[PDB]
Amino acid sequence: VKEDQTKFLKIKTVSSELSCREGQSYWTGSFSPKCLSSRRCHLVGECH
């Protein structure tokens, strides 16, 4: 009714972005080795 109601619904367009659709993935980091050594003479244990 004139001088009444007049309700406004607005659709603001904030932004348009070119998003990514990820495929495969994996994880990685930094690694360092540690070694334990044992020296045995011949015919000792499995020194064959």
Binding site: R40, C41, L43, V44, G45
Partner: protein
């Protein structure tokens, strides 16, 4: 007891024979022996780092 077998160029109480290492270390007899002395499978001196 290996304390009885004489050391090379030494005196002992029992005739004693063995393998190559024993004959290199101790005196292996030329007569009838009383015991057989083999070298230890894995023995030695163990050192840790």
């Amino acid at each position: 007891d290996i304390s009885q077998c004489p050391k090379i160029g030494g005196h002992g109480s029992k005739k004693c024979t063995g393998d190559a290492a024993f004959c290199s270390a101790y005196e292996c007899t030329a007569q009838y022996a009383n015991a057989y002395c083999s070298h230890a499978n894995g023995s030695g001196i163990v050192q840790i780092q």
